[PDB]
Design a protein around this ligand. Structure first.
Ligand code: CHL
Ligand code: CHL
Ligand code: CHL
Ligand code: CHL
Ligand code: CHL
Ligand code: CLA
Ligand SMILES: CCCCCCCCCCCCCCCCCC(=O)OC[C@H](CO[C@@H]1O[C@H](CO)[C@H](O)[C@H](O)[C@H]1O)OC(=O)CCCCCCCCCCCCCCCCC
Ligand SMILES: CC(/C=C/C=C(C)/C=C/[C@@]12O[C@]1(C)C[C@@H](O)CC2(C)C)=C\C=C\C=C(C)\C=C\C=C(C)\C=C\[C@@]12O[C@]1(C)C[C@@H](O)CC2(C)C
Ligand SMILES: CC1=C[C@H](O)CC(C)(C)[C@H]1/C=C/C(C)=C/C=C/C(C)=C/C=C/C=C(C)/C=C/C=C(C)/C=C/C1=C(C)C[C@H](O)CC1(C)C
Ligand SMILES: CC1=C[C@H](O)CC(C)(C)[C@H]1/C=C/C(C)=C/C=C/C(C)=C/C=C/C=C(C)/C=C/C=C(C)/C=C/C1=C(C)C[C@H](O)CC1(C)C
Ligand SMILES: CC1=C[C@H](O)CC(C)(C)[C@H]1/C=C/C(C)=C\C=C\C(C)=C\C=C\C=C(C)\C=C\C=C(C)\C=C\C1=C(C)C[C@H](O)CC1(C)C
Lengths: 34, 221, 222, 217
């Protein structure tokens, strides 16, 4: 059913938020080790 | 310069942008070669010949495909099957293919002879069309004129050029029309006129978009 | 790797002796594959190259478009009925009850097939006319095949070096979509079921359920 | 007769105008490019290679689609499926595919393995044909010779010229006849050899006319 759907939908704001505050510094990581 | 010129009509009209090789020097040059199949001048010359011949045959085809079906109702006619597609069985009829239903008219019941004669007849005609036989030996290939222009309608260059545009536009219209007859004959086994009659009787109860549209997948007529 | 004389080719190690001279490796997706010599004419090559990109993007949209509806209904979200099957979701509007959307009648609820049809010719025809001829509305027209800002809203193509690599990724994801779109078609005309369903059959009995299972389907039986 | 400006033409005397690019110097040149598809010399070269490869495959196919049917109805051997448009179904049987009906020949049972082995073997073979390999290096992409002419039937250049014509001529006839095999099979579910026997039995009644045709509507 949708039980797993609704719960998984909680990840989208979380994943989007983590990136909004980590993407930039992450890009420094793979660029340094490139 | 109307049809033959840089300011000629085009297939997209306003937004239409003409290709470099297409310059309007030839009739029907609405600047439609987005695929790029005529970039070669020699190929383009050959394609123009094919276009007119495919156009001319279709014009004869459109009239020949509609005459038996039309005369069948609007006039007096007893064709075995007025439909253009079901015209081969006319020779397979009991008394053979009878022109206009007349037992004396042609009255051919030999597929071998009618097919063999056509190969002899059309074989010379197409052969003469290419090597320039007696009915015009050194004329233009695509536009011979001369003996093939008995009435001499296009005897003036200016007029002839415009008539050429008309020949293609009527011909190009005919070519798409033949396509319609075929696709519809497949989707609906009826003569083009019978299909038209359905659209006349009900232009909203026949639109393929219903009559057969949801009948091309999953399930069909 | 994807540009220059040492790019990846279509016949791998056996391609060195069979790469058309015109295919020098100057455009995205050049694996040196013109066996028929169709793109030998410079102009014809350019016109085709445009077609290939357009057919690809349409396909790339087509892939998700053909799988999204059935996926959602199966995912346990929304409902579609025949609308799930991409090859049968062409009567949903003709199916009385508004075409709707994501199974919500409060949406398009389209029923007039003649409506969507006409509007389509008008709306797309324009968007195609601009595409056919660069137009002012477009903020960034430059090359017709690759309009920038106006279409590059996120400006991911702003970096020139990335644009090359990114253009190769565009055509290659596009060609994969085109190949799969041709698959969805044939798969349907033969199996007559959903592409996702087809996948379910292969996942069920891979050795039994495959293309050769329906090989005798169109036998020209007398 | 088959080369140079005086070469024979596809339309005979009525040929008249011929494509300028379509001169002699190549086998099977009858001056027939009315569609103007080989105006570009680069494309003409490619089309020439495609024709001879399609032709060589057709000759193999024409002989390969008739021999099992001939042997079956001549009593020479008993196959699982003599007719070509059904021989593929042999893999979906109790005994798999047995060459010449002998259970101790090939005895294939898995269509995958057949498909996998063909992909690997044909892939390498076609790669060798376009980049050289164990059989030889590439000089002419369509006329390698050397290891592919062990008998030396084309050692003399004059015989090589006339022989190339024979191959394209025989090849073209194979392509037309193999195209017939495709259509005859769809219109008549009977095999092509069976069709020939029926035409010989009663040509007036057994032919594309007086049968089918009207059904094709
Ligand atoms: C103003 C908008 C306008 C639009 C959107 C079109 C669109 C079209 N015109 Mg067109 N035309 C337009 C104005 C005009 N045309 C013509 C004269 C022609 C001709 C002579 C022809 C077209 C044809 C076509 C079609 C071929 C292109 C295509 O992709 O077809 C495929 C369709 C899709 C991909 C969808 C197409 C649907 C051709 C056609 O197909 O005619 C039947 C054609 O032969 N137009 C004139 C007169 C100068 C126009 C305006 O004045
Ligand atoms: C197979 C039997 C057969 C019979 C009994 C007839 C009988 C007849 N055909 Mg005939 N045809 C037959 C086969 C064929 N015809 C033709 C093509 C024609 C033409 C073009 C004409 C006739 C015509 C005629 C009539 C006058 C004879 C004439 O001018 O010639 C006549 C009653 C003439 C007619 O229509 O008379 C009214 C006429 O003009 N036939 C072909 C194709 C080449 C045939 C093939 O088998
Ligand atoms: C551009 C690609 C495209 C493709 C691959 C398909 C494919 C399909 N459409 Mg479809 N359509 C497409 C565009 C469009 N359709 C429609 C409107 C419809 C309808 C109304 C129906 C289909 C249906 C179908 C299926 C039957 C084939 C068919 O068209 O039958 C014959 C029809 C045509 C040849 C023309 C149909 C319009 C369009 C040009 C499609 C081609 C089929 C799998 C049928 C279906 O499966 O519904 C259950 C159906 O009922 N289409 C419109 C709106 C104008 C389209 C606009 O772009
Ligand atoms: C290379 C050309 C080739 C062609 C033309 C065919 C044709 C056919 N195979 Mg087949 N096969 C071919 C190669 C191969 N097959 C198989 C394995 C099988 C199996 C296991 C089966 C078939 C079957 C069939 C038939 C399907 C039903 C039928 O009667 O269709 C009617 C179709 C026609 C009368 C006309 C078909 C030809 C048409 C012109 C096709 C279009 C041209 C080609 C696509 C050319 C390009 C080929 C390239 C892409 C490889 C059919 C005639 C089935 C069969 O025979 O069951 C009765 C079957 O079960 N094939 C293998 C090994 C994996 C092949 C390897 O090359
Ligand atoms: C030039 C285009 C052309 C087209 C599109 C068709 C289309 C058709 N014809 Mg032909 N025909 C055409 C030209 C010709 N037919 C015939 C003689 C016949 C016969 C005798 C029959 C057909 C029939 C058919 C149908 C298909 C069956 C078949 O393969 O019969 C053979 C088709 C050809 C030889 C072509 C179909 C509606 C059949 C039909 O539907 O009969 C009612 C049929 O029995 N056609 C001749 C004279 C030899 C033609 C040209 O010269
Ligand atoms: C391009 C996508 C597409 C797909 C996936 C299908 C899929 C299907 N079609 Mg179809 N069809 C299509 C396009 C398509 N069609 C178009 C454009 C036309 C117009 C010529 C048709 C006309 C058509 C007819 C007349 C019929 C089908 C039928 C069928 C079904 C049987 C398979 C078959 O026809 O043998 C391959 C099948 C689910 C048959 C059917 O509906 O099943 C009973 C059938 O009667 N189709
Ligand atoms: C506007 C959109 C309307 C879409 C209506 C969908 C109706 C679905 C009926 C089935 C159902 O509700 O439960 C099944 C699902 C329920 O919702 C779905 O399942 C989970 C959440 O419960 C997951 O989060 C999915 O992502 C979610 O789409 O169907 C939906 O409702 C689709 C989402 C509808 C959102 C409407 C917003 C207004
Ligand atoms: C050639 C091929 C695959 C080629 C693979 C290649 C090149 C490899 C890719 C790589 O390059 C990469 C990406 C990266 C490189 O570093 C390494 C390699 C590994 C080299 C697939 C063929 C795969 C071909 C397959 C599986 C075809 C199956 C056909 C079927 C089932 C036909 C069935 C029927 O046709 C009948 C018989 C009768 C009809 O009437 C009915 C139906 C049902 C249509
Ligand atoms: C290179 C080479 C070289 C040599 O020389 C020669 C040769 C070989 C020829 C070449 C090759 C070529 C090729 C490969 C081609 C291919 C193509 C394709 C397949 C395309 C697709 C294509 C495809 C495509 C576009 C697709 C499209 C689609 C679309 C739009 C849409 C759809 C849909 C959707 C979404 C959903 C719904 O529900 C339904 C519909 C509506 C239906
Ligand atoms: C010249 C000209 C000029 C201008 O340009 C115009 C035009 C017209 C264009 C041109 C022309 C063209 C043409 C004519 C073409 C044709 C083609 C073909 C038909 C091919 C075939 C082709 C064909 C082919 C290859 C074939 C092949 C075959 C095969 C492989 C087979 C196989 C098999 C066998 C054995 C048996 C089994 O059981 C089955 C199988 C397994 C299946
Ligand atoms: C130009 C271009 C441009 C860009 O580039 C793109 C592309 C694509 C490449 C291109 C396009 C094209 C299009 C769009 C379309 C086409 C159409 C058609 C349909 C034609 C026809 C065509 C068609 C035709 C000729 C037809 C013909 C027919 C005939 C003679 C005959 C008929 C008939 C008759 C009387 C009656 C009887 O009972 C039957 C029959 C015997 C059957």
């Amino acid at each position: 059913d949708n039980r797993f759907g609704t719960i998984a939908l909680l990840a989208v704001p979380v994943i989007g938020w983590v990136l909004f505050n980590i993407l930039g510094p992450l890009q420094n990581q793979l660029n340094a080790m490139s | 310069v109307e049809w033959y010129g840089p300011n000629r009509p085009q297939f997209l009209g306003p937004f239409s942008n003409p290709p470099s090789y297409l310059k309007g020097e030839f009739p029907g040059d609405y600047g439609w070669d987005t695929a790029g199949l005529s970039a070669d001048p020699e190929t383009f010359a050959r394609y123009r010949e094919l276009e007119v011949i495919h156009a001319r045959w279709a014009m004869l085809g459109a009239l020949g495909c509609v005459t038996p079906e039309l005369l069948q109702r609007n006039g007096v006619a007893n064709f075995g099957e007025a439909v253009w597609f079901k015209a081969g069985a006319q020779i397979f009829q009991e008394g053979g293919l009878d022109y206009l239903g007349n037992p004396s008219l042609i009255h051919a019941q030999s597929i071998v002879a009618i097919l063999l004669t056509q190969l002899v007849l059309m074989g010379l005609i197409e052969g003469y069309r290419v090597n320039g036989g007696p009915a015009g030996e050194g004329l233009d290939a695509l536009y011979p004129g001369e003996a093939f222009d008995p009435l001499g309608l296009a005897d003036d260059p200016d007029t002839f050029a415009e008539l050429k545009v008309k020949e293609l536009k009527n011909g190009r219209l005919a070519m798409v029309s033949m396509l319609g007859f075929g696709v519809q004959g497949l989707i609906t086994r009826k003569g083009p006129i019978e299909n038209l009659a359905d659209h006349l009787a009900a232009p909203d109860a026949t639109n393929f978009w219903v009559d057969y549209a949801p009948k091309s997948a999953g399930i069909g007529y | 790797e994807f540009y220059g004389p040492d790019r990846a080719k279509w016949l791998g190690p056996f391609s060195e002796g069979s790469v058309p001279s015109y295919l020098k490796g100057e455009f995205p997706g050049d694996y040196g594959w013109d066996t028929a010599g169709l793109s030998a004419d410079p102009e014809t090559f350019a016109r085709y190259r445009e077609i290939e990109v357009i057919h690809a993007r349409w396909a790339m949209l087509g892939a998700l478009g053909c799988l999204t509806p059935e996926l959602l209904q199966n995912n346990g979200a929304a409902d579609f009925g025949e609308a799930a099957v991409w090859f049968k979701a062409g009567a949903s509007i003709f199916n009385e009850d508004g075409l709707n959307y994501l199974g919500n009648p409060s949406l398009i609820h389209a029923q007039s097939i003649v409506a969507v049809l006409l509007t389509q010719l008008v709306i797309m025809g324009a968007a195609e006319a601009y595409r056919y001829s660069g137009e002012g509305p477009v903020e960034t027209s430059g090359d017709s095949l690759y309009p920038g800002g106006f279409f590059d809203p996120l400006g991911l193509a702003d970096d020139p070096d990335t644009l090359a690599e990114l253009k190769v990724k565009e055509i290659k994801n596009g060609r994969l979509a085109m190949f799969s779109m041709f698959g969805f078609f044939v798969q349907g005309l033969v199996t007559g079921k959903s592409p996702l369903e087809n996948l379910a059959d292969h996942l069920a009995e891979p050795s039994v359920n495959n293309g050769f299972a329906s090989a005798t389907k169109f036998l020209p039986l007398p």
